[PDB]
Symmetry: C2
Subunit: 248 residues, 2 copies
């Protein structure tokens, strides 16, 4: 078959694995987010580089929770950095994650989602360890297969998944590459953003439904271009503005 | 069923539609990118806000083309902007797209991918119109269903798809929301980033295979953590450094 359809089939199969193998962990994570909102805590999401894309996909998003904030490490917010190679170097800088966390409004009881495919670099591992040391609840979105087939690059020798309250397995095989061509020597075509974005949307949707089930109107963001959307968004900001950090 | 699995099934079905309905347009777009590389032109990708995530997913990416550059409009690179509401306002600023394009290294014959779900705002429409006026080839990644059910917000009254050499339909139904709960009044849970990232990876993989089929070694990026990856990446930068703008 053609490369487009092989790649799309590989992404579909990964989404089936997530659906069929992570349904309980997704509900657990959604429940944790719901518990955090109900108990008055704050919600944050982080990833480095391309792992940042899934974190951004649930922040200030139509049909997403108004309460989800982005935790930003300058230089690794997407590949928005010059040179782009610096972003990869920053993932190995000990102390950066703690500088970001200590400066943030995150407190004990808050919930932080950490997206890291390999879970082996210093930044996301330190991110999780120090987050827990501050009393945060940590949800990891990580391919656990990496932990059994690679060595940690953190001084502790451990992986992201060793420091999460909840681990969501993003399934991607080591190498993040779904296609192989007889012509091409190296595998190519990564699906990890497809899968991590879908996984994150499932988690946040679950948290939103769980709050509804408890008789709590979920603070979802609405399109401005549907009547009442701006009225709705203003009420949510006024109700939850103290836990929303991307606007005032 | 539970919200996670319904959402994941909705994403799987969208990826099947893309697979089954866009295979020819994906190949055409991949071919255009291949033709652009072979003929000595430059490759760029743009989207505004959450449409930016799919553009970033093919830039400086392991298993992706080294030659794909990000076209950055300050303020709409992801939701990385304070306040996040500014990003939405910027999509309606006439003249921004032309300021970005004229300042870029893009020339006649180069290829530009424009990701816009609705294709109705001033920024992406002006982006496409002015890109074509400069002699660029434009590939749009857009949900065409929006053009038949909404009004354009560009002064011309037209949509992104009216100004593309190739249009890739991202299928998302108007509203970008896949779940409905009896409890919740408004639909929620958007899959548009899932779908646009997968669509973009298919296009770039197709371009890479097409170059291979022509006896051209595809300038893919390799992981640094596989032996020879850095040697490979350096040779590609040295060969194509004049068309790579995220590093020197």
């Amino acid at each position: 078959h053609k490369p487009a359809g092989q790649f799309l089939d590989a992404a579909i199969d990964l989404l089936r694995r997530v659906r069929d193998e992570e349904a309980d962990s997704i509900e657990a994570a959604g429940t944790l987010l719901a518990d955090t909102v109900q108990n008055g805590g704050r919600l944050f999401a982080f990833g480095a580089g391309h792992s940042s894309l899934a974190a951004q996909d649930v922040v200030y998003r139509a049909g997403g929770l108004a309460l989800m904030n982005l935790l930003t490490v300058p230089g690794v917010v997407g590949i928005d950095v010059m040179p782009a190679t610096l972003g990869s170097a920053l993932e190995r800088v000990d102390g950066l994650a703690s500088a970001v966390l200590d400066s943030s409004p995150l407190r004990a009881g808050d919930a932080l989602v950490i997206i890291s495919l390999s879970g082996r670099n210093a930044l996301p591992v330190e991110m999780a360890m120090h987050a827990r040391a501050l009393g945060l609840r940590v949800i990891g979105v990580t391919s656990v297969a990496y932990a059994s087939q690679t060595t940690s690059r953190h001084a502790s020798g451990t992986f992201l998944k060793d420091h999460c309250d909840i681990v969501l397995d993003s399934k991607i095989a080591v190498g993040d590459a779904e296609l192989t061509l007889d012509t091409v020597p190296a595998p190519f075509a990564p699906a990890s953003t497809v899968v991590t974005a879908a996984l994150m949307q499932a988690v946040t949707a679950t948290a939103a439904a769980t709050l509804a089930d408890r008789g709590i109107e979920p603070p979802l963001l609405r399109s401005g271009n549907v009547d009442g959307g701006h009225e709705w968004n203003a009420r949510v900001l006024e109700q939850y503005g103290e836990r929303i950090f991307y606007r005032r």
